[PDB]
C-alpha cells in the first residue's frame, strides 16, 4: 500500500522517425418501495446516497409514477446548482420517460427554458431560477414537489432557497421538499427543518488506490499530461481517465495539447477520445460525453467539478487529481470578488477519488504529495454565502417582503460586513432609496435575468439625460458579455484586427462584432472568414432577444425610441454616451493609472497594482501601436494569477464622466 | 449623531435625489439600516500545491 507514491514520466515515449432494465440496476431501485413510503409521511426529507445511485434521474421519475403530480395539473421542480447539470439530465430523463425533451419532461435555464405551459410535468431548473419564481408566485403554488439536489455543495442560491422555503412549510402543508446530497453529515440540515428524518441509500463502492507524489510539482498540467499516457501506454483496456481541471481556459489548452501528442504518436498508440466537461459547454457536446467509447479506444475526460458531484461518467477507471478548484471570492472590507484558483479542502479530494471506484476498483493519481494533504490542505469546504457580494440576494429578499435580514432563517448567517456593503451597493446604484424602501429603479432591476449593475446600465441607457439612446447598443455589448471566453477561435488580435482596424476598448470591439454580423444577415460564412465562433453568436442573439423582451415590458424600449429622435447621435458621440452607462452601473470597478501601474481607486479598497490580462485588446493596443495608456479604465473581470488581472476593459478618457454619472462616490474620490 | 432608519414592514420614486446623497452618506446608510434592523493568495500559472520561457512540453522521443 505504501508503493502508492509514483514519479512523472513512468520514461518518455516513442514515435517511428433496454434503456429500461439498465434503470433497474441502480442503488436507488431496490429502496423504491421504502423511500416513497417516507416521503408521504414526512414532509420534508433528507436523501443520502453515493454519487451515482440514481437519486436526480429515478426519484422525479418515481414521483410522476406513484401520482404527486396529480394527472399533469401540478408541476415537479428539481433544483440543480449546475448549468451543465440541468440541461443534461433532463436529456436522460426524456429517454429514460419516452417523451420528447420539453413537452413532458424539460429544463429552465436562465437564458433557454425548454418548458411548455400545459403538458410539463417534471422540470429541472438551476438553483437561481427557482428564486426567480418566487417573485412571480411567493407561495411556488403550481409545484407539488421540489427536490433541492446537490444540497451539500452549499452554493448562494441553495442557502436562501432553504430559508425562504422554511417560511412556506406552516403556509403550506401540501407541499413536499425533498433534500438530497452526497453522504456528508446531514445533522446541520435536520436541525434547520426541526429534527428532519434522514434517509441513507447505501452506496456499493470498490475500494481505490491513491497515488501521491514524492515531490511537488513545478507544473500540474505537465504532470497530469504524461499521467494520461503512462496509464494510456501500460494498462489495459477498458479503463477511462477522468482529469479534474479548473477551468474551461485550462481544459482547452490541455485538450490541443493532447491532440498534438496523439498526432505524433500515430497509429501504435491506441485511439484516445477526448470528451471536455465545463460550464459554459454547449448543448450538442453534451451528448458526446456520455456516449460508451467503442471497441479499441480509450476515453479520457477532461472536466471541472461538475463531475465530481452532479454527474457520473459511465467507465472511469482512472481518476487524476491535480487539488485546485477555481472559485469566486469576495472581501467585505475591499468591498470586491475576485476569480482565484485555491487548493480545495479534504472533503473535496475524497469525493474525486470516489470516481474510480464505481464499476471496479481504480486508481487514483494525486499530484501533490501526503504531506500536503495531512497538512496543507483544509477539512471541509467553507460556503458561499461566506465570500459572495450578496447585492443581487438582498435586492431579491427586499422585493419578497424580508425586512428584518438578520432574523431570516440561515442555516450560516451572512457575515455584518458583508451584509453592510451589500446595502450600500444598492444606495449607489439606485436601487434602494434613503429610506431605506425599494424603489422603482429597483423593482425594475428583479425584472431582467441579470445582476443588478447591468440592469442599471440598461436603465441609464434609455432614460439618463446625458445618455439617452444607446439602449441598442447597451443591449448589444451586455449580451456579448455574457458569452466572451466562447467568442474567438485562436488569438483574439487577429480576430479583431479583421473586423475592424482600430479599437480603443473591449466593449466597442464586442459591439463592432455583433454590428458586422448582423450587417452580414447572420451569415455563417462571415464568422468563418473573421475567426468568430458561430455556435457562440448564436447564444448571443438568444441573450439580445430576451434582453430586449423583458426592456419591453419595462418600457425602456419606448423611452429609448423617443430619445433617439430628440439626439440625433453621431457616432463621435455613441461611444462616449456607452462609456458613461456603464460608469453608473459599474462604479466600483474603475481603476486609475499610477506611477506603479494601474491601481484601484476605493479609498477602502487602496492600492492593488492591478496589470491587465493579455487577452485584453487594450493590452494589446500598448505593446504594439505607441498610444500612451488611458489613465481611467473600467473592467468586468478581476483575475488572480500571480498578480491581479483585468478582463472585458473598457477605457475611460474624460475625468468629469465620473463625477457627473456617479457623484456619490467620485466627489470624495476625486 | 448617528442615525437610526427603520424599515416599512408591509407612489412611485424615479431617481433617488441630488440631495438625500447629502443628506444620507454611502456609508452612513449601511450602518443606519442596521441599527433600525436590531445589531447596533496568489497562484502562478499551473503550479502544484506545495511547490514554491515556454520549453514546450513534448514528453515524446524518437
Ligand atoms: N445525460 C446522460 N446520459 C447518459 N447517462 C446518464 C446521463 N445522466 C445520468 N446518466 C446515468 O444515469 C445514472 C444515474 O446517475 P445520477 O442520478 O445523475 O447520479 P446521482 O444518483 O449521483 O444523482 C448514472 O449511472 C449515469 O451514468
Ligand atoms: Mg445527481
Not at chain 1, 98 to 112: A, P, S
Not at chain 1, 438 to 450: A, D, H, Q
Not at chain 1, 453 to 480: D, N, P, R, W
Not at chain 1, 505 to 518: G, K, T
Request: with cysteine; glycine share 6%; charged share 25%.
Amino acid at each position: 500500500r505504501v508503493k502508492r507514491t509514483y514519479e512523472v514520466t513512468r520514461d518518455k515515449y516513442d514515435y517511428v522517425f433496454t434503456i429500461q432494465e439498465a434503470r433497474k440496476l441502480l442503488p436507488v431501485h431496490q429502496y423504491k418501495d421504502e423511500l416513497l413510503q417516507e416521503i408521504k409521511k414526512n414532509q420534508v426529507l433528507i436523501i443520502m446516497g453515493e454519487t451515482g445511485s440514481g437519486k436526480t434521474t429515478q426519484l422525479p421519475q418515481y414521483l410522476v409514477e406513484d401520482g404527486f403530480t396529480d394527472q399533469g395539473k401540478l408541476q415537479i421542480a428539481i433544483t440543480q446548482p449546475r448549468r451543465v447539470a440541468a440541461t443534461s439530465v433532463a436529456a436522460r430523463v426524456a429517454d429514460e420517460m419516452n417523451v420528447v425533451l420539453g413537452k413532458e419532461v424539460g429544463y429552465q435555464i436562465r437564458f433557454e427554458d425548454k418548458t411548455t405551459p400545459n403538458k410539463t410535468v417534471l422540470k429541472y431548473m438551476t438553483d437561481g431560477m427557482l428564486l426567480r419564481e418566487f417573485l412571480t408566485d411567493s407561495k411556488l403554488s403550481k409545484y407539488s414537489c421540489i427536490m433541492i439536489d446537490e444540497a451539500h455543495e452549499r452554493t448562494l442560491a441553495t442557502d436562501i432557497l432553504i430559508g425562504l422555503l422554511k417560511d412556506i412549510l406552516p403556509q403550506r402543508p401540501t407541499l413536499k421538499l425533498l433534500i438530497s446530497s452526497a453522504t456528508m453529515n446531514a445533522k446541520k440540515f435536520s436541525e434547520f427543518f426541526d429534527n428532519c428524518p434522514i434517509f441513507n441509500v447505501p452506496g456499493r463502492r470498490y475500494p481505490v488506490d491513491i497515488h501521491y507524489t514524492l515531490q511537488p510539482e513545478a507544473n500540474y498540467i505537465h504532470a497530469a499530461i504524461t499521467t494520461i499516457f503512462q496509464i494510456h501506454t501500460t494498462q489495459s483496456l477498458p479503463g477511462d481517465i477522468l482529469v479534474f481541471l479548473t477551468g474551461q481556459e485550462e481544459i482547452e489548452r490541455t485538450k490541443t495539447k493532447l491532440e498534438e501528442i496523439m498526432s505524433k504518436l500515430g497509429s501504435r498508440t491506441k485511439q484516445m477520445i477526448i470528451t471536455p466537461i465545463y460550464a459554459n459547454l454547449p448543448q450538442e457536446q453534451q451528448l458526446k460525453i456520455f456516449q460508451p467509447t467503442p471497441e479499441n479506444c480509450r476515453k479520457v475526460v477532461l472536466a471541472t467539478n461538475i463531475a465530481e458531484t452532479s454527474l457520473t461518467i459511465d467507465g472511469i477507471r482512472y481518476v487524476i487529481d491535480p487539488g485546485f478548484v477555481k472559485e469566486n471570492s469576495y472581501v467585505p472590507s475591499t468591498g470586491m470578488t475576485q476569480l482565484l484558483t485555491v487548493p480545495c479542502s479534504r472533503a473535496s479530494v475524497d469525493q474525486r477519488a470516489g470516481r474510480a471506484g464505481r464499476v471496479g476498483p481504480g486508481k487514483c493519481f494525486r499530484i501533490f504529495t501526503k504531506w500536503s494533504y495531512l497538512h496543507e490542505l483544509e477539512l471541509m469546504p467553507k460556503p458561499e454565502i461566506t465570500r459572495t457580494n450578496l447585492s443581487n440576494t438582498v435586492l431579491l429578499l427586499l422585493s419578497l417582503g424580508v425586512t428584518d435580514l438578520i432574523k431570516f432563517p440561515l442555516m450560516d448567517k451572512p457575515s455584518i460586513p458583508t451584509l453592510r456593503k451589500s446595502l450600500e451597493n444598492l444606495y449607489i446604484l439606485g436601487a434602494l432609496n434613503s429610506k431605506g424602501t425599494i424603489t422603482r429603479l429597483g423593482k425594475m432591476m428583479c425584472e431582467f435575468p441579470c445582476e443588478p449593475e447591468f440592469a442599471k446600465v440598461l436603465y441609464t441607457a434609455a432614460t439618463h439625460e446625458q445618455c439617452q439612446g444607446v439602449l441598442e447598443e447597451c443591449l448589444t455589448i451586455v449580451s456579448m458579455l455574457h458569452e466572451t471566453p466562447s467568442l474567438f477561435i485562436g488569438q483574439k488580435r487577429d480576430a479583431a484586427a479583421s473586423v475592424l482596424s482600430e479599437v480603443e476598448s473591449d466593449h466597442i470591439l464586442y459591439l463592432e462584432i455583433f454590428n458586422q454580423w448582423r450587417n452580414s444577415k447572420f451569415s455563417r460564412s462571415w464568422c468563418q472568414d473573421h475567426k468568430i465562433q458561430f455556435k457562440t453568436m448564436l447564444r448571443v442573439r438568444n441573450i439580445r432577444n430576451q434582453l430586449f423582451r423583458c426592456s419591453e415590458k419595462v418600457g425602456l424600449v419606448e423611452k429609448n425610441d423617443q430619445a433617439r429622435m430628440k439626439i440625433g447621435n453621431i457616432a463621435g458621440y455613441i461611444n462616449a454616451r456607452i462609456t458613461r452607462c456603464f460608469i453608473s452601473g459599474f462604479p466600483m470597478n474603475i481603476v486609475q493609472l499610477g506611477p506603479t501601474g494601474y491601481q484601484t481607486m476605493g479609498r477602502s479598497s487602496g492600492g492593488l497594482n492591478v496589470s491587465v490580462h493579455p487577452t485584453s485588446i487594450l493590452f494589446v493596443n500598448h505593446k504594439e501601436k505607441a498610444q500612451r495608456p488611458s489613465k481611467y479604465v473600467l473592467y468586468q473581470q478581476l483575475m488572480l494569477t500571480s498578480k491581479e488581472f483585468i478582463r472585458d476593459c473598457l477605457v475611460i478618457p474624460k475625468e468629469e464622466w465620473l463625477i457627473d454619472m456617479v457623484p456619490q462616490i467620485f466627489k470624495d474620490l476625486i | 449623531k448617528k442615525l437610526v432608519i427603520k424599515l416599512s414592514e408591509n407612489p412611485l420614486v424615479e431617481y433617488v435625489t441630488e440631495k438625500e446623497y447629502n443628506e444620507v452618506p454611502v456609508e452612513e446608510f449601511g450602518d443606519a439600516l442596521l441599527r433600525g434592523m436590531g445589531w447596533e493568495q496568489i497562484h502562478p500559472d499551473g503550479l502544484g500545491i506545495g511547490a514554491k520561457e515556454e520549453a514546450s512540453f513534448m514528453p515524446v522521443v524518437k
